[PDB]
Design a protein around this ligand. Sequence first.
Ligand code: ZN
Lengths: 48, 88, 40, 130
Amino acid sequence: SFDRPEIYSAPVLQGESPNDDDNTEIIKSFKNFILEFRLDSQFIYRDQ
Amino acid sequence: PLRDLDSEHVSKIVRLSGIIISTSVLSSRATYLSIMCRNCRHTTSITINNFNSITGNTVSLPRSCLSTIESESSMANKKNCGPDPYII
Amino acid sequence: NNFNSITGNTVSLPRSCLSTIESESSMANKKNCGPDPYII
Amino acid sequence: PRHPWKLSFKGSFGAHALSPRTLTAQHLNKLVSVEGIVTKTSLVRPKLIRSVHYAAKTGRFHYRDYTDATTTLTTRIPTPAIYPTEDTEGNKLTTEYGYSTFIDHQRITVQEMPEMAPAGQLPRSIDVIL
Ligand SMILES: [Zn+2]
């Protein structure tokens, strides 16, 4: 009457080099655009 | 311009101007729905974050019960739940 | 009344519910009962 | 000063006092008294009746009841409810062994007695679920 086996992961090695067409790198670039964009002197999207 | 739209613009972002003739009533689309199998009573959740499609169910209820293929329980108590067994 | 057959179910349970084709009730309350819905 | 009470039967059975050879299909769905010899007995196995589970995220206990066709004399619509590993909200469930209930189950084979059996024929037997 046992429960589920569970699957989980943890980052260990660097892996292959990142690719621009990879979804994770596109998400990271979008995140950097949200955080670091400056219109005149303000973080407009972060504050928004 | 609206009449200068072309097949080259298909599946691409377009900026276009005009006047709005009608706004319909608000329909209710599901984002998160919890579903349960009819006789199996297997419980599943479906998350929808995409709503662009018109005239089509691009995301629907699964055609068969997902309990058997998962085989998550060790006991696994031929049993077939049937086509479209899930209830929202 | 026929038991002559061997290694064969010459008579078996119907493959779909017979309520719809009969249409016996006037109300008739798309609903499909499923393949092999009958229980002995 | 909770378990439902059961019934046992004694006395004359008349035409229902039979042997494993004398058991026929006309006696199906009837109460029969059958005398013979026990030849094979199975391992005593527990059968899960109610499984109790714990959700640590909500800290709540859930349960599910299971029945089979041998438990009830009358047939019922078979609703096979799987062993729950999620609650309704998706939280992981852990089995609470010791709060679940298991009923002992056995199957024996009763063959007709070698002194009441014909001297040359192969014997006839029947399974009994206890
Ligand atoms: Zn199911």
